Design a protein around this motif. Sequence first.
Motif, PDB file in Angstrom:
ATOM      1  N   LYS A  34       0.832  -1.180   0.000  1.00 32.29           N
ATOM      2  CA  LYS A  34       0.000   0.000   0.000  1.00 32.29           C
ATOM      3  C   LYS A  34       0.881   1.250   0.000  1.00 32.29           C
TER       4      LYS A  34
ATOM      5  N   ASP B 244       0.362  10.944   0.503  1.00 27.40           N
ATOM      6  CA  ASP B 244      -0.671  11.921   0.407  1.00 27.40           C
ATOM      7  C   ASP B 244      -0.124  13.354   0.423  1.00 27.40           C
TER       8      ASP B 244
ATOM      9  N   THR C  75       2.835   5.797   2.158  1.00 29.50           N
ATOM     10  CA  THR C  75       1.509   6.277   2.291  1.00 29.50           C
ATOM     11  C   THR C  75       0.931   5.898   3.655  1.00 29.50           C
ATOM     12  N   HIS C  76       0.161   6.815   4.235  1.00 31.35           N
ATOM     13  CA  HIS C  76      -0.494   6.623   5.480  1.00 31.35           C
ATOM     14  C   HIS C  76      -1.314   5.312   5.440  1.00 31.35           C
ATOM     15  N   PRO C  77      -1.351   4.572   6.558  1.00 33.26           N
ATOM     16  CA  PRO C  77      -2.024   3.279   6.661  1.00 33.26           C
ATOM     17  C   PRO C  77      -3.543   3.377   6.507  1.00 33.26           C
ATOM     18  N   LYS C  78      -3.947   3.442   5.279  1.00 36.00           N
ATOM     19  CA  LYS C  78      -5.295   3.448   4.859  1.00 36.00           C
ATOM     20  C   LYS C  78      -5.320   2.937   3.432  1.00 36.00           C
ATOM     21  N   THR C  79      -6.475   2.849   2.853  1.00 37.68           N
ATOM     22  CA  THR C  79      -6.614   2.475   1.480  1.00 37.68           C
ATOM     23  C   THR C  79      -6.389   3.696   0.579  1.00 37.68           C
ATOM     24  N   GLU C  80      -6.449   3.498  -0.739  1.00 36.72           N
ATOM     25  CA  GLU C  80      -6.346   4.562  -1.702  1.00 36.72           C
ATOM     26  C   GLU C  80      -7.490   5.531  -1.530  1.00 36.72           C
TER      27      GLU C  80
END
Length: 161
Positions: free
Chosen positions: A101, A107, A155-160
């Motif tokens: 991911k 971001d 990228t920050h631990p989240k989805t797109e």
Amino acid sequence: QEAGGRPGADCEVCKEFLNRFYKSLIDRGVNFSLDTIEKELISFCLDTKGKENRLCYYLGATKDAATKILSEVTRPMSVHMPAMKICEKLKKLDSQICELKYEKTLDLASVDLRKMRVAELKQILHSWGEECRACAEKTDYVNLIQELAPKYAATHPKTEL
């Protein structure tokens, strides 16, 4: 066969890319061998950058790798092992191939690089595990961060989404 437009379930990195790739083997009449698939997996990854590119590297199919990957995707692909039945089983062995991911970009698209304060930027660089033993002001950091961005961009631990 394959559905053509299926959901990127299980592993979206380890699906779409390799599935698009498989087609480029079939469509172009490429010989499906350990040898030849390894090579094409390297070159096919030229247009890609980011999750896919990380994936390529894990599959040894990069210029920054000495290649020579065997049962790990390459071997099953060489015996008509469609992309949708590989990563699904891979998860049960390794997940680093799937949890990519850490995209082509952070971001930084969501944040203004000029409103920022060196401290924020320091958090960014720390998020990309780097150490600036030569850095000065936020503007210096910005300039540096922008070029280092696609190389790391954790990228920050989240989805797109």
